[PDB]
């Protein structure tokens, strides 16, 4: 009702699990608050250059702007941070990409990013992190990191079931716990905030299955379930058990003997995928100390949030880190950094994150060539040391380009 | 009743907040399971060498072995993993040190380490991590890390209030939530584990106060409250607000202007301590990318568990990392690594963790000189490249010593 759906262009279609993508598909994009205003123009430009190059004119993307966050209040009015038609439109057109999003404080409004993920039941947050040769890194051997994070997006403490200290609600559920559940374990039951952490069997088996399938499909070497289950037995310890169980029941997992690790034969390559677990505090060490030991990572919502950020810092890509939130009916590719308001409009930040998320998008649509061209362009530009301010600070010999210009540098190395 | 309390030796005493340590104090030690059997002998030897050297014969520690974990079942019988007199004895004698501890699975027995912390209300888990010059590190500039973690030990998800998926209990509290609290937010309420995360005002103000006091007392530059409060408003977002509030109300915190950061003047040095917060996923990046920006860290129980391990890996000290659990009435210094059963009895693991925890112990007792001698000995031995297998693997030029021998190498460099 304020979106102008393109005259030329045809919806992607979901024909029983598989995506039927037209040659002129309408992809919705949410511009993004803050630096979205800079990074997004850079991505439409390089995706367009990459599908024109790959398919020689045959295919073209019809971009359709939809609204969430701060720009939505300037379009639908002050109170609408998340319009109900953005949810219908993403659902409808099947794949979408977005830039960074401002959630307001003071309004009782929960994270708009998390909101899109729960509202549209996009239960897979998939964050790939690998090293691009030549980016500055804090660590000695970032080239050893090449991991894929499958982070659960629909349950854990992120469900947002919590009550204020001294509220009536909080007073009521603490009474139920102490009186009716007989809990003698809250150190200070007075002035006490309360949060609920749910972890169900369906929620974790659907994420673990996506994780192992991804491993089979790209014949990755292993799947590590990380958790803190020695302390949280019935939510995080349930997650490692339900994941070993699904590997044994649905993928023919077998002990590498003695336990606990499982072998899964990839039906396609003949290779074995090891299915293992590491406790989450030790994991944060093991990714710094032995990165080559790890590959596909399956984990619950809070832990995957931390593991992503941490893995991203080490390979030197906190501003060129892509991501996706995938469910059964649709997907939303996103820049994974924030809105950086101090730089907005200055054309200077790194468009690399939202760009590499459009190669994930292009890849997901089956436009694999367009997509391989974007990562070709990326390695080209970085290796050219034809880089944006964030990378240049840390490099000797680089040429500083603006945001729009690193767009063009990616197109030149295609 | 199986402990043999020393003939010579006198209890430490708590005379209103301050510790009155005799010259021949009885310190209880829990040997430790697994490699405790190796690392502990090494620490009694070097602490003894360091108090003999410093005080020239005047002072001597009377060691008193007490039991927890696997060795306790071999002393009190199969069922007693944690004897009730270990809690009375630590309480009584005021300071104690322990080695790594085996908690059994299959028995419904929760973490024995966490058990000591909650049972004796040791609400401060204090983990200092700084770089010792010459230890092998995964990162380029570990010398930039010098941080002190104040991790809350008595509440958060670690309280252990949780119920099994499909249990009656779990079925009952999910019914209360959906029916009586009106929660329409559990994606899958069937087959669902449930955990409780409590965060009270007293629990966080006592930990934040210890954190800022430590900053004043050693005039450290800042205190960073880390949290994930944008998603968890009433437990983790309550923690950053209660911590800013205590800085303003009890330490005369003032805005560095515009907010949110506070200045606290150190009453002793005249210097200002900045009181700031960073969201926990960004923090895990900022400790890799800008370590010099951070110093004293205050945070809740799960986050501090992860932050410690992560910071410890980077400076290359996952086996030489000390710690303490401190409450108002007593303290327990501990090796912070595990029991490593494959190496037990081989005299080969690094005794550096439990040793550096005894310098924290010695320091806490006011035997500051003994203590400065242990860290002198540590920098000496490591710099000598007279090192244990874990360090030698990663170094070119080192001499490999056994565990007992790196004990002696620390004594030689005193
Ligand atoms: Mg995050
Ligand atoms: Mg830990």
- Structure determined via: X-ray
Cβ contact B352:B391 at 8 Å: no
| Pair of tokens at residue A161 | 């079931």
Assign A371 to helix, strand or coil: helix
Interstrand relation of B331-335 and B95-98 (parallel, antiparallel or unpaired) = parallel
Q: What are residue A400's DSSP bridge partners?
A: A387
Considering only CA atoms, which of A155, A236, A152 is closest in space to residue A196? A155
Residue A281 bears catalytic tag: yes
Is B154 close to A189, i.e. CB distance below 8 A?
A: no
Q: What are residue A44's DSSP bridge partners?
A: none
Q: How many residues does chain B have?
A: 414
Chain center to CA of A219 = 21
Interstrand relation of A222-227 and A272-279 (parallel, antiparallel or unpaired) = parallel
Sheet holding A162-163, edge to edge: A162-163, A192-200, B192-200, B162-163
- Between chain A and chain B, the number of residue pairs with CB atoms below 8 A apart is 242
Is B161 close to A170, i.e. CB distance below 8 A?
A: no
Report how far residue A227's alpha carbon sits from residue A233's, in angstroms, rounded to the nearest whole number.
10
Is A195 close to B197, i.e. CB distance below 8 A?
A: yes
Report how far residue A331's alpha carbon sits from residue A97's, in angstroms, rounded to the nearest whole number.
8
Cβ contact B230:A111 at 8 Å: yes
CATH number at residue B347: 3.40.718.10
Considering only CA atoms, which of A409, A60, A200 is closest in space to residue B165? A200
Q: What is the DSSP letter of A25?
A: B
Q: What are phi and psi of A40, to 5 degrees?
A: -55, -50
Considering only CA atoms, which of A85, A104, A156 is closest in space to residue A125? A156
Distances (CA, A) of B182 to A108, A173, B40, B189: 18, 12, 54, 13
Report how far residue A291's alpha carbon sits from residue A309's, in angstroms, rounded to the nearest whole number.
15
Residue B6: Cβ within 10 Å count:
15
Q: Which helix (H) or strand (E) holds B207?
A: helix B201-217
**Breaks in chain B after (C-N > 2.5 angstroms):** none
Into how many domains does chain B fold?
1
Is A201 close to B191, i.e. CB distance below 8 A?
A: yes
Q: Which residue has the tokens 């990074």?
A: A39
Distances (CA, A) of B366 to B12, B369, B375: 12, 8, 15
| Pair of tokens at residue B313 | 């890996």
Q: Is residue A91 marked as binding?
A: no
Which ligand has its closest atom nearest to the C-alpha of B336?
Answer: 2
Q: Tell me how far apart the terminal alpha carbons of chain B are, to the nearest angstrom.
A: 38
Task: Report the chain A residue with the minimal C-alpha distance to residue B202.
Answer: A188
Q: Which residue has the tokens 């909101």?
A: A115
Report how far residue A273's alpha carbon sits from residue B275's, in angstroms, rounded to the nearest whole number.
47
* Residue A159 with chain B: CB contacts under 8 Å: 185-187
Cβ contact A173:A183 at 8 Å: no
Report how far residue A234's alpha carbon sits from residue A238's, in angstroms, rounded to the nearest whole number.
5
Cβ contact A224:A179 at 8 Å: no
| Dihedral in degrees, nearest 10, Cα atoms A312, A315, A319, A321 | -60
Give A69 Cα–ligand 1 centroid separation in angstroms: 17
Query: Which residues lie closer than 8 Å to B280 by C-beta, 6 or more apart?
Result: A306, B226, B227, B228, B299, B303, B307
Report how far residue A217's alpha carbon sits from residue A113's, in angstroms, rounded to the nearest whole number.
28
Distances (CA, A) of B134 to B140, B145, B146, B351: 12, 14, 15, 17
Interstrand relation of B162-163 and B262-265 (parallel, antiparallel or unpaired) = unpaired
Report how far residue B254's alpha carbon sits from residue B223's, in angstroms, rounded to the nearest whole number.
14
Considering only CA atoms, which of A136, A148, A149, A144 is closest in space to residue A291? A144
Q: Is residue B237 marked as binding?
A: no
| Pair of tokens at residue A228 | 């803190």
| Pair of tokens at residue B388 | 């244990």
Is A193 close to B183, i.e. CB distance below 8 A?
A: no
Q: What are phi and psi of B395, to 5 degrees?
A: -115, 145
Q: What are phi and psi of B282, to 5 degrees?
A: -60, -35
Report how far residue B301's alpha carbon sits from residue B151's, in angstroms, rounded to the nearest whole number.
6
* Residue B108 with chain A: CB contacts under 8 Å: none
Residue A276: Cβ within 10 Å count:
17
Spell out where A292-365 has E strands: 296-299, 322-326, 331-335
Cβ contact B138:A289 at 8 Å: yes
| Pair of tokens at residue B398 | 């080192």
- Name the region of B125 (left: φ>0; alpha: ψ -120 to 50; beta: rest): beta
Task: Report the chain A residue with the minimal C-alpha distance to residue B114.
Answer: A231
Cβ contact A116:A333 at 8 Å: no
Peptide bond into B260 cis (omega under 30): yes
Give A404 Cα–ligand 2 centroid separation in angstroms: 45
| Pair of tokens at residue A312 | 């991203």
Considering only CA atoms, which of B314, B413, B338, B284 is closest in space to residue B99? B338
Cβ contact B334:B324 at 8 Å: yes
Report how far residue A363's alpha carbon sits from residue A358's, in angstroms, rounded to the nearest whole number.
8
Distances (CA, A) of A177 to A168, B29, B195, B239: 14, 37, 12, 22
Report how far residue B288's alpha carbon sits from residue B294's, in angstroms, rounded to the nearest whole number.
11
DSSP per-residue string spanning B273-333: EEEEEEEHHHHHHHHHH-GGG--EEEE-HHHHHHHHHHHHHHTT-TTS-EEEEE-SS-EEE
Q: Tell me how far apart the terminal alpha carbons of chain A are, to the nearest angstrom.
A: 38
Buried b (16+ CB within 10 A) or exposed e, B345-382: eebbbbbbbbbbbbbbbbbbbebeebbbbbbbbbebbb
Active site residues of B: 158, 228, 281, 305
Range of the domain at B208: 1-414
Query: Which residues lie closer than 8 Å to A11 by C-beta, 6 or more apart?
Result: A22, A25, A26, A92, A93, A94
Interstrand relation of A162-163 and A254-255 (parallel, antiparallel or unpaired) = unpaired
Report how far residue B275's alpha carbon sits from residue B251's, in angstroms, rounded to the nearest whole number.
11
Chain center to CA of B50 = 22
């Amino acid at each position: 009702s304020k979106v102008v759906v393109p005259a030329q262009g045809k919806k992607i279609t979901l024909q029983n699990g598989k995506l039927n993508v037209p040659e002129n598909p309408i992809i919705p994009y949410i511009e993004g608050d803050g630096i979205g205003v800079d990074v997004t123009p850079a991505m439409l430009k390089v995706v367009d250059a990459a599908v024109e190059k790959a398919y020689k004119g045959e295919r073209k993307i019809s971009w359709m702007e939809i609204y969430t966050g701060e720009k939505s209040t300037q379009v639908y009015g002050q109170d609408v941070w998340l319009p109900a038609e953005t949810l219908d439109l993403i659902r409808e057109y099947r794949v979408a990409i977005k830039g960074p999003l401002t959630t307001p404080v003071g309004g009782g409004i929960r994270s708009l990013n998390v909101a899109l993920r729960q509202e549209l039941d996009l239960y897979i947050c998939l964050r790939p992190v690998r090293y691009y040769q030549g980016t500055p890194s804090p660590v000695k051997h970032p080239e050893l990191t090449d991991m894929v994070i499958f982070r659960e997006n629909s349950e854990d403490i992120y469900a947002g079931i919590e009550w204020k200290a001294d509220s009536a609600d909080a007073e009521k559920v603490i009474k139920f716990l102490r009186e009716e559940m007989g809990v003698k374990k809250i150190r200070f039951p007075e002035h006490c905030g309360i949060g609920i952490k749910p972890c169900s069997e369906e929620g974790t088996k659907r994420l673990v299955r996506a994780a192992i399938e991804y491993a089979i499909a790209n014949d990755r070497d292993s799947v590590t379930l990380v958790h803190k289950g020695n302390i949280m037995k019935f939510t995080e310890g349930a997650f490692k058990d339900w994941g070993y169980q699904l590997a044994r029941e649905e993928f023919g997992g077998e002990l590498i003997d003695g336990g606990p690790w499982l072998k899964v034969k990839n039906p396609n390559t003949g290779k074995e995928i090891v299915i293992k677990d590491v406790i989450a505090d030790a994991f944060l060490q093991q990714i710094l100390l032995r990165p080559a030991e790890y590959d596909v990572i399956a984990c619950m919502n809070l832990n995957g949030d931390y593991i992503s950020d941490a893995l991203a810092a080490q390979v030197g890509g906190i501003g060129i880190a892509p991501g996706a939130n995938i469910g059964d009916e649709c997907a939303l590719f996103e820049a994974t950094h924030g809105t950086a308001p101090k730089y907005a409009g200055q054309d200077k930040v790194n468009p690399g994150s939202i760009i590499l998320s459009a190669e994930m998008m292009l890849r997901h649509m089956g436009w694999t060539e367009a997509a391989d061209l974007i990562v070709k362009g990326m390695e080209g530009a970085i290796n050219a040391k034809t880089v944006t301010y964030d990378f240049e600070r840390l490099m000797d010999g680089a040429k500083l380009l603006k945001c729009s210009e690193f767009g063009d540098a990616i197109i030149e190395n295609m």
